[PDB]
């Protein structure tokens, strides 16, 4: 069930599709970035078409929609990456096993592109190019994180296996989310940009 | 897509089904165990019916069956663990972030044994306060594998010049595999829980 807005892949399961500047999809993703990163230069935006990652992600979304009995489990977040990690992420998504993990040992995602645009996260390559993903994240029901978590905390210490879906720095006004499982995050767009 | 021989779960997502000695399902697991663990006695064998773990595992299996072409990608392996881990594994499966360092490390992942005797070591199937040991029988997507090494946080590339095209798992020895390490969520389905004693 590959999304409508995807383009034909000639029976292949993986493609990076450069977006056309000035068309709807490009303008949408550009505005989300320029909200907080209007001083950077965008070189290009690519749609990640990974059928395996998409399928595993959609299975987790349908499971979380059943478990939570509601369907607002998804958010659009940012993830800065060094050039050398881009091929891995395009292919295999985000891997907690691969900076400071103050809110737990998972994969980190920023509400604001400004945060992901830090050189510690979006490390400039030899040519000055920085890389940031726009990511669909199953944040689901969340609580405040803490150092050393390997999974989100229990929703009630009387059932230690019924878990929050993610953790955050701040539950009232979140600026980051940590997920602790593979296939809880779909890398949807890659932005290549410069300072 | 839940298997047709599972007990009806009443729209429930999870349950453990106690098996009857004399049924083929119980007897084949007992034979597989006793092949190398003839000194121990089985208390019970439970079929694990976890709808969500099953779906995610079956999606990974279909993807590996597509990627590899006519490989036997699945092996039935053993995993001994402490009583404290059993409720988490039953609900959530095998989390590499929680895995022990193995005495011979072929990578930082979850370890599965070919031989029940290996999983039956007190270091893995730690006796609980009542002297009960716990061992899972696990469908593992071993796929295409190579000899691992202690540094690995994922299986290594098949080809150094193509770093993202990975082996599916690693082993101690490709000639005589006795253990497999997996590095991803939903690559192992816990199918049965063996409770046993001395
Ligand atoms: C404290 O927050 C983080 C810790 C670690 C991070 O990745 C190493 C990270 C954040 S926010 C963010 N956006 N993009 C990335 N990679 N990250």
Coordinates of C-alpha atoms and ligand atoms in Angstrom, one line a residue:
Chain A
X1 CA 0.0 0.0 0.0
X2 CA 2.7 2.5 -1.2
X3 CA 1.4 6.2 -0.9
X4 CA -0.3 8.1 -3.8
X5 CA 2.3 10.9 -3.9
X6 CA 5.1 8.4 -4.5
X7 CA 6.3 8.1 -8.2
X8 CA 6.8 4.8 -10.1
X9 CA 9.9 2.8 -9.1
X10 CA 9.9 0.3 -12.1
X11 CA 9.2 -2.7 -9.8
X12 CA 12.1 -1.7 -7.5
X13 CA 11.6 -1.3 -3.7
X14 CA 14.0 1.7 -3.1
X15 CA 14.4 5.2 -4.8
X16 CA 15.5 8.7 -3.7
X17 CA 13.4 11.2 -5.8
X18 CA 14.6 14.8 -6.0
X19 CA 11.6 17.1 -5.6
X20 CA 10.9 19.9 -8.2
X21 CA 11.3 23.4 -6.6
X22 CA 8.1 25.5 -6.7
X23 CA 5.7 22.5 -6.7
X24 CA 3.3 21.8 -3.8
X25 CA 5.3 19.0 -2.1
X26 CA 8.6 20.9 -2.3
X27 CA 6.9 24.2 -1.0
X28 CA 5.3 22.3 2.0
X29 CA 8.6 20.6 3.2
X30 CA 10.6 23.9 2.5
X31 CA 8.2 26.0 4.7
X32 CA 8.5 23.5 7.6
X33 CA 12.3 23.9 7.5
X34 CA 12.4 27.7 6.8
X35 CA 10.0 28.2 9.8
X36 CA 13.2 28.2 12.0
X37 CA 16.0 27.8 9.3
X38 CA 15.3 30.7 6.9
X39 CA 19.1 31.8 7.0
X40 CA 20.3 28.5 5.5
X41 CA 20.5 27.7 1.7
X42 CA 18.5 24.7 0.4
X43 CA 20.4 22.8 -2.4
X44 CA 17.7 20.1 -2.7
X45 CA 14.9 18.0 -1.1
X46 CA 14.6 14.3 -1.9
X47 CA 11.5 12.1 -1.2
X48 CA 12.8 8.7 0.4
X49 CA 10.7 5.9 -1.3
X50 CA 11.7 2.8 0.9
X51 CA 8.8 0.2 0.6
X52 CA 10.3 -2.1 3.3
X53 CA 10.8 0.7 5.9
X54 CA 7.3 2.2 4.9
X55 CA 5.6 -1.2 5.4
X56 CA 7.2 -2.0 8.8
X57 CA 6.4 1.6 9.9
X58 CA 2.7 1.4 8.7
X59 CA 2.3 -2.0 10.6
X60 CA 3.6 -0.3 13.8
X61 CA 1.2 2.7 13.2
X62 CA -1.9 0.4 12.8
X63 CA -0.8 -1.5 16.1
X64 CA -0.3 1.9 18.0
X65 CA -3.7 3.2 16.6
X66 CA -5.4 -0.1 18.0
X67 CA -3.4 0.0 21.4
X68 CA -4.1 3.8 22.0
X69 CA -7.8 3.6 20.8
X70 CA -7.2 6.9 18.9
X71 CA -5.2 7.9 15.7
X72 CA -3.1 11.0 16.7
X73 CA 0.1 8.9 17.3
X74 CA 2.2 10.5 14.4
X75 CA 4.3 13.7 14.3
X76 CA 6.6 15.3 11.7
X77 CA 10.0 15.9 13.3
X78 CA 13.6 16.6 12.2
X79 CA 16.8 14.6 12.5
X80 CA 20.2 16.0 11.6
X81 CA 22.8 13.4 10.3
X82 CA 26.5 13.4 9.1
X83 CA 27.0 12.7 5.4
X84 CA 28.5 9.2 6.2
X85 CA 25.2 8.0 7.9
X86 CA 22.8 9.1 5.0
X87 CA 23.1 5.9 2.9
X88 CA 22.4 3.7 6.0
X89 CA 19.4 5.9 7.1
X90 CA 17.9 6.0 3.5
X91 CA 18.1 2.1 3.5
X92 CA 17.6 1.0 7.1
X93 CA 16.1 4.0 8.9
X94 CA 17.1 5.0 12.5
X95 CA 19.1 2.7 14.7
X96 CA 19.5 3.5 18.5
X97 CA 22.6 1.2 18.5
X98 CA 24.6 3.7 16.3
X99 CA 26.3 13.0 21.3
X100 CA 24.5 13.2 24.7
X101 CA 21.5 10.9 25.3
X102 CA 20.1 12.8 28.4
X103 CA 16.5 11.6 27.9
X104 CA 17.4 7.9 27.2
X105 CA 19.2 5.5 24.8
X106 CA 17.0 5.9 21.7
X107 CA 16.9 7.9 18.5
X108 CA 16.4 11.7 18.9
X109 CA 14.0 13.9 16.8
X110 CA 13.6 17.7 17.1
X111 CA 10.3 19.7 16.8
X112 CA 12.3 22.6 15.2
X113 CA 14.8 22.3 12.2
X114 CA 16.9 24.9 14.0
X115 CA 17.8 22.3 16.7
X116 CA 18.7 19.6 14.1
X117 CA 20.6 22.2 12.1
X118 CA 23.3 22.4 14.9
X119 CA 26.7 21.2 13.4
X120 CA 26.9 18.5 16.3
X121 CA 23.8 16.8 14.6
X122 CA 23.9 18.0 10.9
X123 CA 27.8 17.9 10.6
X124 CA 29.0 19.9 7.6
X125 CA 30.8 17.7 5.1
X126 CA 34.1 18.5 3.2
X127 CA 32.0 20.8 0.8
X128 CA 30.0 22.5 3.6
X129 CA 26.8 20.5 2.9
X130 CA 24.6 19.7 5.9
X131 CA 21.9 16.9 5.9
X132 CA 18.6 16.8 7.8
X133 CA 15.6 14.3 7.5
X134 CA 11.9 15.2 7.8
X135 CA 10.7 12.1 9.7
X136 CA 7.2 10.6 10.4
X137 CA 7.5 9.6 14.1
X138 CA 5.1 7.4 16.1
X139 CA 5.4 9.5 19.3
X140 CA 2.0 8.2 20.5
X141 CA 1.4 8.7 24.3
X142 CA 4.6 10.3 25.8
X143 CA 6.1 11.2 29.2
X144 CA 9.2 13.0 30.4
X145 CA 12.5 11.0 29.7
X146 CA 15.6 10.6 31.9
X147 CA 19.2 9.4 31.4
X148 CA 19.7 5.7 31.0
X149 CA 16.3 4.6 29.8
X150 CA 16.5 1.6 27.2
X151 CA 12.7 1.7 26.7
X152 CA 10.0 4.3 27.5
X153 CA 8.8 4.0 31.2
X154 CA 5.6 2.0 32.1
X155 CA 2.3 3.9 32.0
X156 CA 1.6 2.3 35.5
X157 CA 4.2 0.5 37.7
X158 CA 1.4 -2.0 38.5
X159 CA 1.7 -3.2 34.8
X160 CA 5.4 -2.8 34.0
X161 CA 4.9 -4.0 30.4
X162 CA 2.3 -1.4 29.3
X163 CA 4.7 1.3 28.0
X164 CA 4.6 4.9 26.9
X165 CA 5.3 5.1 23.1
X166 CA 8.0 7.8 23.4
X167 CA 9.7 10.2 25.9
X168 CA 10.2 14.0 25.6
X169 CA 12.3 16.8 27.4
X170 CA 9.0 18.5 28.4
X171 CA 5.4 17.1 28.2
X172 CA 3.6 20.5 28.1
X173 CA 5.9 22.0 25.4
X174 CA 8.0 19.3 23.8
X175 CA 11.1 20.3 21.7
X176 CA 12.4 16.7 21.3
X177 CA 11.1 13.1 21.2
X178 CA 13.1 9.8 21.8
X179 CA 11.8 6.5 20.4
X180 CA 13.4 3.2 21.5
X181 CA 12.3 0.8 18.7
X182 CA 13.1 0.1 15.0
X183 CA 10.2 1.1 12.6
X184 CA 8.8 3.8 14.9
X185 CA 10.3 6.5 12.6
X186 CA 10.0 6.7 8.7
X187 CA 12.6 9.0 7.1
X188 CA 10.3 10.8 4.5
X189 CA 12.4 13.7 3.1
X190 CA 16.2 14.4 3.0
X191 CA 17.1 18.2 3.0
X192 CA 20.6 19.0 1.7
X193 CA 21.5 22.6 2.8
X194 CA 24.4 25.0 3.7
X195 CA 25.1 27.7 6.3
Chain B
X1 CA -3.1 -13.1 9.3
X2 CA -3.0 -15.0 12.7
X3 CA -2.3 -18.8 12.3
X4 CA -5.5 -20.9 12.2
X5 CA -4.4 -23.5 14.9
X6 CA -4.0 -20.7 17.5
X7 CA -6.8 -20.7 20.2
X8 CA -9.4 -17.9 19.8
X9 CA -8.1 -14.9 21.8
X10 CA -11.5 -13.1 22.1
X11 CA -10.3 -10.0 20.3
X12 CA -7.3 -10.1 22.9
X13 CA -3.8 -9.3 21.6
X14 CA -1.9 -11.7 23.8
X15 CA -2.2 -15.0 25.6
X16 CA -0.1 -18.1 26.7
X17 CA -1.5 -21.5 25.8
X18 CA -0.4 -24.5 28.0
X19 CA 0.3 -27.6 25.7
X20 CA -0.7 -31.2 26.4
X21 CA 1.9 -34.0 26.4
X22 CA 1.0 -36.6 23.7
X23 CA 0.1 -33.8 21.2
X24 CA 2.7 -33.6 18.3
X25 CA 3.2 -29.8 19.1
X26 CA 4.3 -30.6 22.7
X27 CA 6.2 -33.8 21.8
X28 CA 8.4 -32.2 19.0
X29 CA 9.5 -29.3 21.3
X30 CA 10.3 -31.9 24.1
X31 CA 12.3 -34.0 21.6
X32 CA 14.2 -30.9 20.4
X33 CA 15.0 -29.9 24.0
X34 CA 15.9 -33.4 25.3
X35 CA 18.2 -34.1 22.3
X36 CA 20.9 -32.1 24.3
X37 CA 19.2 -31.5 27.7
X38 CA 18.3 -35.1 28.8
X39 CA 19.4 -34.4 32.4
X40 CA 16.6 -31.7 33.0
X41 CA 12.8 -32.3 33.2
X42 CA 10.2 -30.1 31.6
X43 CA 7.4 -28.6 33.9
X44 CA 5.3 -27.2 31.0
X45 CA 5.5 -25.8 27.5
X46 CA 3.4 -22.7 26.7
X47 CA 2.6 -21.6 23.1
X48 CA 3.1 -17.7 23.0
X49 CA 0.2 -16.0 21.0
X50 CA 1.3 -12.4 20.6
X51 CA -0.6 -10.9 17.6
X52 CA 1.5 -7.7 17.3
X53 CA 5.0 -9.5 17.6
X54 CA 3.7 -12.1 15.1
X55 CA 2.6 -9.5 12.5
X56 CA 5.9 -7.5 12.7
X57 CA 7.9 -10.7 12.6
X58 CA 5.9 -12.0 9.6
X59 CA 6.4 -8.6 7.7
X60 CA 10.3 -8.9 8.3
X61 CA 10.2 -12.6 7.2
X62 CA 8.3 -11.7 3.9
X63 CA 10.8 -8.9 3.2
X64 CA 13.8 -11.2 3.8
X65 CA 12.1 -14.0 1.6
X66 CA 11.8 -11.3 -1.2
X67 CA 15.4 -9.9 -0.7
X68 CA 17.3 -13.3 -0.6
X69 CA 15.4 -15.5 -3.1
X70 CA 14.8 -19.2 -2.2
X71 CA 16.9 -19.1 1.0
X72 CA 15.6 -21.0 4.1
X73 CA 15.7 -17.7 6.1
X74 CA 14.2 -19.0 9.4
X75 CA 15.8 -21.4 12.0
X76 CA 14.1 -22.6 15.3
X77 CA 16.5 -21.6 18.1
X78 CA 16.7 -21.5 21.9
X79 CA 17.0 -18.5 24.3
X80 CA 17.5 -19.0 28.0
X81 CA 16.7 -16.0 30.2
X82 CA 15.9 -15.0 33.9
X83 CA 12.3 -15.0 35.3
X84 CA 12.5 -11.2 35.5
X85 CA 12.8 -10.9 31.7
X86 CA 9.9 -13.4 30.9
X87 CA 7.0 -10.9 31.1
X88 CA 8.8 -8.3 28.9
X89 CA 9.9 -10.9 26.2
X90 CA 6.3 -12.4 26.2
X91 CA 4.8 -8.9 25.4
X92 CA 7.7 -7.1 23.6
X93 CA 10.1 -9.7 22.2
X94 CA 14.0 -9.7 22.3
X95 CA 15.5 -6.2 22.8
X96 CA 19.3 -6.0 22.0
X97 CA 19.5 -2.9 24.3
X98 CA 18.8 -5.4 27.3
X99 CA 21.1 -8.3 26.0
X100 CA 23.8 -9.8 28.2
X101 CA 27.5 -9.7 27.0
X102 CA 28.0 -13.3 25.8
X103 CA 31.1 -15.2 27.2
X104 CA 32.2 -15.5 23.5
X105 CA 31.0 -12.3 21.8
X106 CA 30.4 -12.3 18.1
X107 CA 28.6 -8.9 18.4
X108 CA 26.4 -6.6 20.4
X109 CA 23.0 -8.3 19.7
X110 CA 20.6 -10.9 21.0
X111 CA 22.0 -14.5 21.1
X112 CA 20.1 -17.6 20.1
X113 CA 21.5 -21.2 20.5
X114 CA 21.2 -24.2 18.2
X115 CA 21.4 -26.5 21.3
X116 CA 19.1 -26.3 24.3
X117 CA 22.1 -27.5 26.4
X118 CA 23.7 -24.0 25.7
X119 CA 20.6 -22.0 26.7
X120 CA 20.2 -24.4 29.8
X121 CA 23.4 -23.0 31.4
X122 CA 22.5 -21.1 34.7
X123 CA 24.2 -18.0 33.2
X124 CA 21.3 -17.8 30.7
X125 CA 18.3 -19.7 32.2
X126 CA 18.9 -18.4 35.7
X127 CA 17.1 -20.6 38.2
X128 CA 14.3 -18.5 39.9
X129 CA 13.7 -18.6 43.7
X130 CA 11.6 -21.8 43.1
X131 CA 14.4 -23.5 41.1
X132 CA 12.5 -23.0 37.8
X133 CA 14.6 -22.3 34.6
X134 CA 13.0 -20.6 31.5
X135 CA 14.0 -21.2 27.8
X136 CA 12.2 -19.8 24.8
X137 CA 11.9 -21.6 21.4
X138 CA 12.3 -18.9 18.9
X139 CA 11.7 -18.4 15.1
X140 CA 14.8 -16.4 14.1
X141 CA 15.4 -14.8 10.7
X142 CA 19.1 -15.9 10.4
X143 CA 18.9 -15.5 6.6
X144 CA 22.4 -15.2 5.0
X145 CA 25.1 -15.1 7.8
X146 CA 28.8 -14.8 8.4
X147 CA 31.2 -15.3 11.3
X148 CA 30.7 -12.3 13.6
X149 CA 33.2 -10.3 15.7
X150 CA 32.9 -8.5 19.1
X151 CA 32.8 -4.9 17.8
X152 CA 29.5 -5.4 15.6
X153 CA 26.4 -3.2 16.5
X154 CA 24.8 -4.4 13.2
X155 CA 25.7 -7.4 11.0
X156 CA 28.6 -6.5 8.7
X157 CA 28.4 -5.6 5.0
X158 CA 28.6 -8.5 2.5
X159 CA 30.9 -6.1 0.5
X160 CA 33.2 -3.4 2.1
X161 CA 32.5 -1.1 -1.0
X162 CA 28.7 -1.4 -0.4
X163 CA 28.5 -0.7 3.4
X164 CA 24.6 -0.7 3.6
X165 CA 24.1 -4.1 2.0
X166 CA 24.3 -6.3 5.2
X167 CA 24.3 -9.9 6.2
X168 CA 21.0 -10.8 8.0
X169 CA 22.8 -12.3 11.1
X170 CA 26.2 -13.5 12.4
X171 CA 27.3 -16.9 13.8
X172 CA 30.3 -18.3 15.8
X173 CA 31.2 -20.6 12.9
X174 CA 29.6 -20.9 9.4
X175 CA 30.8 -24.6 9.0
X176 CA 29.2 -25.6 12.4
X177 CA 26.8 -22.9 13.6
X178 CA 26.1 -23.2 17.4
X179 CA 24.9 -19.6 18.0
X180 CA 23.3 -16.7 16.0
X181 CA 23.3 -13.0 16.9
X182 CA 20.5 -10.7 15.6
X183 CA 20.7 -6.8 15.7
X184 CA 17.2 -5.7 14.8
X185 CA 13.7 -5.7 16.5
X186 CA 11.1 -8.2 15.1
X187 CA 13.8 -10.6 13.6
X188 CA 12.9 -13.2 16.3
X189 CA 9.4 -14.4 17.4
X190 CA 9.2 -16.1 20.8
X191 CA 7.0 -19.1 19.9
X192 CA 7.2 -21.4 23.0
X193 CA 8.3 -20.9 26.7
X194 CA 9.8 -24.1 28.3
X195 CA 9.7 -24.1 32.1
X196 CA 12.0 -26.8 33.4
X197 CA 13.9 -27.9 36.6
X198 CA 16.8 -30.2 37.7
Ligands
LIG1 C1 19.4 16.4 22.8 O1 18.8 16.2 21.5 C2 19.5 15.4 20.7 C3 20.5 14.5 21.0 C4 21.1 13.7 20.1 C5 20.8 13.8 18.7 O2 21.4 13.1 17.7 C6 22.7 12.6 17.9 C7 19.8 14.7 18.3 C8 19.1 15.5 19.3 S1 17.9 16.6 18.7 C9 18.4 16.1 17.1 N1 18.0 16.5 15.9 N2 18.8 15.7 15.0 C10 19.6 14.9 15.8 N3 20.5 14.0 15.3 N4 19.3 15.1 17.1

